[PDB]
Design a protein around this ligand. Structure first.
Ligand SMILES: [Zn+2]
Ligand SMILES: [Zn+2]
Lengths: 105, 149, 99, 190
């Protein structure tokens, strides 16, 4: 959103002149072309995106309740890896405390 | 609209617009109020965009009960309006306004009530108003996180 | 709960005006808290006019009595009168322990 | 650009508005204090030591309401029904004069918001002092307007009324004096 420079307030959009005219309750107008041509946004596969599990995938190697498999880590050569299965497509991600991640994630 | 209803011994069953709670404690800037929910107003992200659209829409939604103080940027007027809408004994809304001491008494009573029944686990004095606002923003952030699935 | 959550500070309108000060007075503020709270062991009276004796649970079960212990409260009352001149009169009284 | 606190601006503003200098510095710190003690500097809380101090938000809100009402004054032509606090100062002005108000009146916002946020996350006491000094500087700038003459009275009266309303609002959160508790029509008051 556009924050009014005088009073820290959100300003309406009110497309009138063929472009965006940001109007505030204090009367200030900013014009403001280019950067704010995006009016509406909606991501339809939320709950399965990368940033949904980013913290969990980062913390997965240190979680003692996560499944481990007898697979060698290509980075630090530990004999085991943490195995994750996220999403409705059952994406398998192998992670290690050294920071290795199985390509995806 | 994102409405916050506080049910306590002092008062209950009153849905206040969320930004009015932040405004009553001195946080009147919309950017600072929204920053309490998104934690960063200048981060592109994906949750931040969705949350910012919801909060911007919720700020401008017209409320039937809090209509006069919706666009008020002075916290004293919002505190007075809440005091009038909350206090049981204020059955005459105009007589007391002439007396300045009456207005001060209502404001002090409302501020004490708010410090006692708004997130009392985070503090019950006037030193923790901003911390309470941070916690409330965190709660709204979690709710909006659940909202986007 | 009694000593912290049950403090009273209520101002009531003065209802009497058959005196010059009575017309002067328009409100009195009642303010009291509780200072000592203690619950004793269940007791009972035999003679109906005698000393309270210990009530054993079997007697309470047989007689349909309540296995309940006395609650003793000690309070401090502060009464403040208000007049139409900006002054106030304070009468401070301490309530002795009572059941 | 470096900033340093200037108590002379607060002294001057107190002289203009006839209030004591301690009243201005008590903005946002008048809660739980009688106005008699506030104007005499009695019981003044120590300067803030954390960003979570409500005094910072209170003084920022005071500066914000000042700037909001100033912008409302500078854009009367936009509002079909201008706000009451601004309406009474433009009844004797023409549409051409109202439209000229946008360019004649200076912009006093400057870089207040970014500097305040930086100080709040860096130095809370400096943030509070900066907010109070900025409010005083903005009031003095609006008060010391000499050209054009047809706007000097308007800007002077607006600045006086705005800062008086701000102080009264901060005063309306102070300790009340003795009064009739039955002014609210009801048998009881709690
Ligand atoms: Zn604005
Ligand atoms: Zn590894």
């Amino acid at each position: 959103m556009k924050i009014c420079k005088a009073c820290s307030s959100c300003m309406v959009r009110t497309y009138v002149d063929g472009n965006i005219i940001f109007r505030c309750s204090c009367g200030e107008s900013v014009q403001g072309d280019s950067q704010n041509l995006l009016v509406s946004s909606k991501v339809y596969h939320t709950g399965e995106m990368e940033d949904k599990y980013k913290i969990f995938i980062k913390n997965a190697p240190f979680d003692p309740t996560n499944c481990q498999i007898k697979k060698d880590c290509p980075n630090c050569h530990l004999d085991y890896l943490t195995q994750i299965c996220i999403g409705s497509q059952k994406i398998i991600i192998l992670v290690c405390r050294c920071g290795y991640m199985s390509n995806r994630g | 609209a994102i409405t916050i209803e506080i049910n306590s011994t002092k008062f209950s069953k009153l849905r206040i617009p969320w930004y009015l709670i932040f405004r009553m404690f001195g946080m009147t800037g919309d950017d600072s109020i929204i920053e309490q929910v998104v934690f960063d107003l200048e981060s592109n992200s994906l949750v931040n965009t969705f949350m910012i659209e919801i909060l911007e829409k919720s700020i401008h939604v017209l409320d039937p009960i809090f209509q006069p103080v919706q666009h008020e940027l002075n916290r004293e007027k919002i505190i007075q309006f809440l005091s009038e809408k909350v206090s049981k004994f204020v059955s005459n809304p105009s007589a007391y306004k002439s007396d300045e001491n009456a207005v001060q008494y209502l404001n002090e009573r409302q501020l004490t009530i708010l410090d006692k029944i708004l997130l009392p686990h985070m503090g019950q004095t006037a030193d923790t108003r901003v911390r309470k606002l941070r916690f409330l923003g965190l709660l709204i952030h979690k709710i909006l996180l659940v909202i986007m699935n | 709960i009694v000593k912290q959550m049950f403090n009273v500070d209520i101002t009531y309108k003065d209802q009497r005006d058959h005196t010059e000060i009575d017309k002067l007075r328009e409100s009195v503020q009642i303010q009291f808290n509780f200072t000592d709270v203690n619950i004793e062991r269940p007791q009972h009276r035999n003679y109906s006019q005698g000393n309270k004796i210990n009530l054993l649970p079997n007697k309470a079960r047989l007689c349909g009595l309540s296995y309940s212990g006395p609650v003793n409260l000690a309070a401090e009352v502060i009464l403040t009168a208000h007049y139409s001149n900006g002054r106030q009169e304070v009468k401070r009284a301490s309530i002795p322990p009572f059941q | 650009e470096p900033w340093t606190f200037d108590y002379g601006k607060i002294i001057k503003t107190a002289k203009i508005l006839d209030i004591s200098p301690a009243v201005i510095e008590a903005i946002g710190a008048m809660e739980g204090r009688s106005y008699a003690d506030i104007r005499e500097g009695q019981g003044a809380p120590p300067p803030p030591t954390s960003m979570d101090d409500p005094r910072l938000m209170a003084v920022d809100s005071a500066v914000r309401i000042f700037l909001y009402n100033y912008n409302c004054l500078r854009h009367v032509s936009t509002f079909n029904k201008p706000p009451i606090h601004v309406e009474r100062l433009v009844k004797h002005l023409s549409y051409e004069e109202k439209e000229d108000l946008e360019k004649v009146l200076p912009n006093v916002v400057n870089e207040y918001h970014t500097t305040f946020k930086h100080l709040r996350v860096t130095d809370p006491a400096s943030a509070l002092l900066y907010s109070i000094e900025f409010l005083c500087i903005s009031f003095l700038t609006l008060y010391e307007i000499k050209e054009p003459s047809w706007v000097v009275n308007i800007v002077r009266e607006f600045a006086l009324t705005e800062l008086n309303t701000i102080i009264q609002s901060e005063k309306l959160l102070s300790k009340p004096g003795a009064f009739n508790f039955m002014i609210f029509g009801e048998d009881f008051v709690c």
